[PDB]
Design a protein around this ligand. Structure first.
Ligand SMILES: Cc1csc2cc([C@H](C)Nc3ncnc(N)c3C#N)c(-c3cccc(CN(C)C)c3)c(=O)n12
Length: 827
């Protein structure tokens, strides 16, 4: 039933669908209808995809950014398997041919008709790529583990597809009548009003008269800008404050509606509380109409006037110094700005990637200048992905510019889209209207790729407790669900597990304050062994990675950390995956995990860029996902311990040492006996170099032995990222105990130590080359509202850390000084 689906979406998204109809908002109604049709169209296209196309949608390939290898292969409808010896250069089709020839000798009598599933995972090996190019095979080679694959026939893939079915005349200056206000404060009240195009003012800010603290103004506010000169994306901003400075509230609105009509007349603005004008703030009123301060205003009836159509704009827009023009196109003076504007046609024809610089010099408060800009923009060639990411920033608020950025971003591969999905979702917070190119783009890509769909859902769902986005995000999630009824049910199962984990964690938090850890753990186990818990916590796709299946919860191995937020440690097992089904998740409630996730995704991007230059620093890109209000999951890295635990140098252990400095190296030796130690020290050195560079570039502070971990392989990694971008200028950090392992336990080992400095330098030089990408991504991230990523000073931190202004030689000299200063600071 359609009524059951509506109740299922309401429970899933955390907002009743009946709440959308109650708003009596035509913009909400049109978004709902239009996006339902768009998403149902994508669903219709999906149900008819060929079986290889269904594989690409549901299990997109996980590829890396000669030698012999053993692979265990079984068929779907059999327990029997065969261990084959293939090459790392061999294609999956060669492996499938071997599997079918071996099955032919057993059963006594087409590789193209199969795909190779990774046992116990929603992950497949298919296509013309050597086995070593697959992330699963690559991971198996580094750990020494044998790949375990399953031959799945095309009929079985199709069975999965089927089961998962669904104007220029108005020259008068702009003016408003400020009628009256509302709510309490301590003084007189002043309403400051500003007209903006993004962060930049269209005219000077004008204030109304001071009135003592239900205020009544009934005052005319006039602005130094003509009505015909108002850009399409013009934003009228307000700030209500008190004076003898005491900020009270703020409110913004678009001067044109979603249907391009210039707004008239009376508007009641339900204001948002403050920390004075906030141009980047939402243009939708505070939904808490009971307690919110309100500001009533009147927009004069200029008569029904709409913003001129594109055909009209283009018609109006249609109507040796080259040396200095080139040098400035690599903050600028007023004469330089006029040079760019005068030679705008030459920018289009010979310097198209300088469009951003041209957009920042155009006079957005003059409609003739805008029409001239838009005429060039509509015939402007498509720009690279890097250029388009810059154009998504609030510094480029025009709708045609926004539509241009999206058009250039259609060439993003699913892998690049996934890499930047977090920032693209944050850009939605800068959006002026509900129906927009970015939402249509995100919804389209999400419905064409199940992994993208999963993370788009969770990035939106985890922000539903935030009033300023709840409406927009709820509507996008409802639209998505219309596009995939099956994935909606898959996501509901995840939500049911998270609901139980929250309830379980609340119980643990209460119990842990009354009794011992063994007693709370046994009580946690008793709660989990209840049928409702056993059922809800088992057989789901991990919110951290939909390719990871969490089969049977292993209650005996579940525990909690008897500190701070009392996070839970949840273990799983799967007979179908064998040792690969043994995975864990950490559930944590009480901390905002958004910065933790951003820090880990930024380190993961560093790893990708390094690998693209053939540099593998053996990083540990474990998952971290916010799922709700101060709630999230962390992927467990098994076979790892904290540096602090190892450094405790406990007795009757294989790691016990004569000197504390040897505990870490002895731990490594105990986990890597004989010939394996060399490989382990190498893994430690590489990862130590990656994390030294990463923590330095990102300004990660408060680093101690309790928030640094080591894998049994030797790979070092970081946990509990509470602080970044120097928010307590953090120096480069070298630790003597780590230098000691690098130096193979020798006091003097310049050969090993300088190989390590070489790793650090190469890692650093690579990131500098992609410096602009980090700046563009962090600029989009400002939209998230993270307190450590609020201003220009936070972005300036990356510029200084990557030394972007300097030359490669100057930067490397400067980095070498910071490394030497850290080496001297290390005892
Ligand atoms: C019970 C529990 C609930 S949350 C939690 C976290 C951790 C560690 C700190 N973090 C991580 N571990 C693995 N993968 C990760 N991605 C993280 C993270 N982030 C441990 C833990 C693990 C091993 C060794 C010790 C040291 N102990 C013996 C003194 C602690 C732990 O036991 N728990």
């Amino acid at each position: 039933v359609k009524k059951l689906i509506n109740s299922q979406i309401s429970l899933l998204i955390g907002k009743g669908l009946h709440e959308f109809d109650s708003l009596r908002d035509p913009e909400v109604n049109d978004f709902r209808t239009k996006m339902r049709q768009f998403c149902e169209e994508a669903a219709a296209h999906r149900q008819q995809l060929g079986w290889v196309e269904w594989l690409q949608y549901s299990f997109p390939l996980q590829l890396e950014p000669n030698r012999a290898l053993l692979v265990n292969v079984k068929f779907e409808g059999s327990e029997e398997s065969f261990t084959f010896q293939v090459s790392t250069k061999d294609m999956p089709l060669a492996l499938m041919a071997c599997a079918l020839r071996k099955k032919a000798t057993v059963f006594r009598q087409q590789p193209e008709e199969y795909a190779l599933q990774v046992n116990g995972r929603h992950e497949y090996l298919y296509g013309n790529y050597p086995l070593c190019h697959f992330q699963y095979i690559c991971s198996c080679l580094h750990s020494g583990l044998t790949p375990h694959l399953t031959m799945v026939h095309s009929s079985s893939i199709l069975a999965m597809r089927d089961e998962q079915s669904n104007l220029w005349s108005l020259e008068q200056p702009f003016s408003i009548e400020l009628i009256e206000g509302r709510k309490v404060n301590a003084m007189k009240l002043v309403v400051q009003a500003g007209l903006f195009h993004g962060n930049e003012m269209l005219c000077k800010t004008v204030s109304s008269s001071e009135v003592n603290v239900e205020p009544v103004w009934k005052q005319r506010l006039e602005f130094d800008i003509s009505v015909c000169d108002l850009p399409r994306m013009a934003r009228l901003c307000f700030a209500l404050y008190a004076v003898v400075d005491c900020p009270i509230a703020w409110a913004n609105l678009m001067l044109f509606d979603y249907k391009d009509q210039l707004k008239t007349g009376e508007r009641c603005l339900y204001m948002w509380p403050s920390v004075l004008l906030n141009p980047a703030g939402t243009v939708r009123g505070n939904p808490n109409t009971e307690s919110a301060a309100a500001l009533v205003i009147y927009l004069p009836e200029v008569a029904p006037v709409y913003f001129p159509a594109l055909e009209k704009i283009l018609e109006l827009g249609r109507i040796t110094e080259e040396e200095l023009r080139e040098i400035l196109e690599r903050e600028l003076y007023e004469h330089e700005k006029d040079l760019v504007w005068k030679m705008r046609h030459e920018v289009q024809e010979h310097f198209p990637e300088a469009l951003a610089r041209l957009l920042l010099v155009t006079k957005w408060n003059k409609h003739e200048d805008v029409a001239q800009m838009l005429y060039l923009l509509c015939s402007w060639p498509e720009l690279p992905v890097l250029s388009a990411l810059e154009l998504l920033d609030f510094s480029f608020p025009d709708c045609y510019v926004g539509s241009f950025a999206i058009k250039s971003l259609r060439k993003l591969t699913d892998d690049e889209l996934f890499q930047y999905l977090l920032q693209l979702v944050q850009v939605l917070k800068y959006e002026s209207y509900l129906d927009c190119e970015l939402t249509k783009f995100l919804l389209g890509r999400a419905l064409a790729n199940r992994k993208i769909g999963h993370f788009l859902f969770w990035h939106l769902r985890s922000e539903m407790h935030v009033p300023s986005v709840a409406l927009r995000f709820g509507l996008i999630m409802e639209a998505y669900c219309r596009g995939s009824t099956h994935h909606m049910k898959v996501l509901m199962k995840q939500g049911e597990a998270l609901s139980k984990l929250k309830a379980l964690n609340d119980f643990v938090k209460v119990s842990s304050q009354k009794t011992t850890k063994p007693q709370t753990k046994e009580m946690m186990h008793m709660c989990m062994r209840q049928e409702t818990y056993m059922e809800a916590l088992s057989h789901l796709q991990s919110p951290l990675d939909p390719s990871t299946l969490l089969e049977e919860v292993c209650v005996e191995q579940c525990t909690f950390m008897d500190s701070k937020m009392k996070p839970l440690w949840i273990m799983y097992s799967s007979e179908e995956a064998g040792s690969a089904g043994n995975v864990g998740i950490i559930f944590k409630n009480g901390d905002d995990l958004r910065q933790d996730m951003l820090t880990l995704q930024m380190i993961q991007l560093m790893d990708v860029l390094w690998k693209q230059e053939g540099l593998d620093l053996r990083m540990t890109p474990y998952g971290c996902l916010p799922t709700g209000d101060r709630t999230g999951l962390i992927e467990v890295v098994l076979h790892s311990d904290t540096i602090a635990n190892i450094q405790l140098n406990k007795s009757n252990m294989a790691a016990t040492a004569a000197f504390n400095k040897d505990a870490l190296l002895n731990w490594l030796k105990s986990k890597n006996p004989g010939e394996a130690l060399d490989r382990a020290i190498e893994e430690f050195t590489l990862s130590c170099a990656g994390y030294c560079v990463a923590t330095y570039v990102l300004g990660i502070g408060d680093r101690h032995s309790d928030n640094i971990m080591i894998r049994e392989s030797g790979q070092l990694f970081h946990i509990d990222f509470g602080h970044f971008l120097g928010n307590f200028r953090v120096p480069f950090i070298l630790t003597y105990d780590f230098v000691h392992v690098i130096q193979q336990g020798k006091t003097n080992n310049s050969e090993k130590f300088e190989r390590f400095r070489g790793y650090c330098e190469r890692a650093y030089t690579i990131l500098r080359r992609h410096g602009l990408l980090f700046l563009h991504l962090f600029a989009l991230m400002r939209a998230a509202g993270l307190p450590e990523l609020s201003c220009s000073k936070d972005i300036q931190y990356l510029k200084d850390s990557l030394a972007l202004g300097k030359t490669e030689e100057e930067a490397l000299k400067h980095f070498r000084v910071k490394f030497n200063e850290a080496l001297r600071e290390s005892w």
